[PDB]
Each structure stands twice: as structure tokens, then as C-alpha cells.
Amino acid sequence: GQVGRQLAIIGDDINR
Amino acid sequence: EDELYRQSLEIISRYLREQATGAKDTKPMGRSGATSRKALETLRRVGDGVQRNHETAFQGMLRKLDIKNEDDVKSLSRVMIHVFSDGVTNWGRIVTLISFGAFVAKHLKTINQESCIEPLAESITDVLVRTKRDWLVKQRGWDGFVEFFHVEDL
């Protein structure tokens, strides 16, 4: 996948 | 000049350098060094966990980006821009970028690209401070980072 999107998804998880 | 840049760079560089070299930099911090120490401490706790919990994806993203020289670090600034392209900014995304930075910086050292860690830390700082300054300032900068990830007591 696109790394940015992937990173955002991880980031949104870490944000929790 | 920009203190936020300076402080962000200090924190991100230290984490990246420290993660890549395995050596904690004993040199005191610059200004907002209390904040930066705690930011770095926070970065270690949260960042290290991000790399552990998302190591497979980080490896995949690293293999995909194929970061092997200073130029490739630009490709990472692009990706970090892409992170924020949906308009959402939060500390989880920010720390994840820094965490991935540390992950990349580790890999960078295994390939005599230690020279690229400073550009790496720079590009991460630049993306954050250049494009998310308003959000950063609104979140009280690295104090907001420390507070956001502060582990509360009962």
C-alpha cells in the first residue's frame, strides 16, 4: 500500500 | 532561528541518532530542555513501542521506500506529507512518523548511511514544523506531545 496512508493508519492507532 | 524547529530537531535527531547508534546522547538539551528531555523520554517509550508493534509494516514500508541514501530521505518527506494529506493531524501520526524515522535511521546505520540520519531527522522535523506548525503551536508543541502520551496515575 501507499506508505503515507499506512503510516496515517498506524498513527491513528498510536493516537488512541 | 525557529525555536520550534530547533527543539523538534533536537528531539527527533536525538531519538533517531540514539535509536540508530544505541547511544543515549548525554549532552544536555538546548532550550525547553525539560520539555525536550520528557519529549525524548516519551518518544522512547511510545516510539519504541510503535516500532515493536508495527515492525512488520515498518519493514514493509522501509523495503518499499528503499531508503538507501540522502536523496531517498526526500522520498520520506513525500510520504510524511502524504500522511497528513487527509487533513488529520494528531500526536499518534506524529510520533509514528518519528518512530518510523528511528526505524529508518537504524537501517540507515546498517548501510554506512549514518550521514543520512541527520537529513532524515531534518526532513521529519521540516515536515512537522514547516507544514504542521499551527497545529503544533495549538497543541503547545512538545509539551502537548508529552501530555498527550503521559501515562496517568490512578
Swiss-Prot record, chain A:
Tissues with expression: Expressed in a wide variety of tissues, with highest levels in the heart and skeletal muscle.
Localisation: Mitochondrion outer membrane
Chain span(s) of sequence motif BH3: 3-16
Domain of life: Eukaryota
Membership in a protein family: Belongs to the Bcl-2 family.
Domain description: Intact BH3 motif is required by BIK, BID, BAK, BAD and BAX for their pro-apoptotic activity and for their interaction with anti-apoptotic members of the Bcl-2 family.
Function: Plays a role in the mitochondrial apoptotic process. Upon arrival of cell death signals, promotes mitochondrial outer membrane (MOM) permeabilization by oligomerizing to form pores within the MOM. This releases apoptogenic factors into the cytosol, including cytochrome c, promoting the activation of caspase 9 which in turn processes and activates the effector caspases.
Complexes and interactors: Homodimer. Formation of the homodimer is zinc-dependent. Forms heterodimers with BCL2 and BCL2L1 isoform Bcl-X(L). Forms heterooligomers with BAX. Interacts with BCL2A1. Interacts with RTL10/BOP. Interacts with VDAC1. Interacts with GIMAP3/IAN4 and GIMAP5/IAN5.
Name of the protein in its database record: Bcl-2 homologous antagonist/killer
Gene this protein is translated from: BAK1
UniProtKB/Swiss-Prot annotation, chain B:
Protein name in UniProt: Induced myeloid leukemia cell differentiation protein Mcl-1
Reported effect, residue 24 to R: Reduced ubiquitination
Glycyl lysine isopeptide (Lys-Gly) (interchain with G-Cter in ubiquitin), cross-linked positions: 24, 27
Sequence motif BH1, residues: 82-102
Domain of life: Eukaryota
Regulation: induction: Expression increases early during phorbol ester-induced differentiation along the monocyte/macrophage pathway in myeloid leukemia cell line ML-1. Rapidly up-regulated by CSF2 in ML-1 cells. Up-regulated by heat shock-induced differentiation. Expression increases early during retinoic acid-induced differentiation.
Portion of the parent chain present: 171 to 324 of 350
Family: Belongs to the Bcl-2 family.
Motif (BH2): 134-149
Record's comment on post-translational modification: Cleaved by CASP3 during apoptosis. Treatment with taxol or okadaic acid induces phosphorylation on additional sites.
Function as written in the Swiss-Prot or TrEMBL entry: Involved in the regulation of apoptosis versus cell survival, and in the maintenance of viability but not of proliferation. Mediates its effects by interactions with a number of other regulators of apoptosis. Isoform 1 inhibits apoptosis. Isoform 2 promotes apoptosis.
Assembly: Interacts with HIF3A (via C-terminus domain). Interacts with BAD, BOK, BIK and BMF. Interacts with PMAIP1. Interacts with BBC3. Isoform 1 interacts with BAX, BAK1 and TPT1. Heterodimer of isoform 1 and isoform 2. Homodimers of isoform 1 or isoform 2 are not detected. Isoform 2 does not interact with pro-apoptotic BCL2-related proteins. Interacts with RTL10/BOP. Interacts with BCL2L11; may sequester BCL2L11 to prevent its pro-apoptotic activity. Interacts with GIMAP5 and HSPA8/HSC70; the interaction between HSPA8 and MCL1 is impaired in the absence of GIMAP5.
Subcellular location field: Membrane; Cytoplasm; Mitochondrion; Nucleus, Nucleoplasm
Motif (BH3) on chain: 39-53
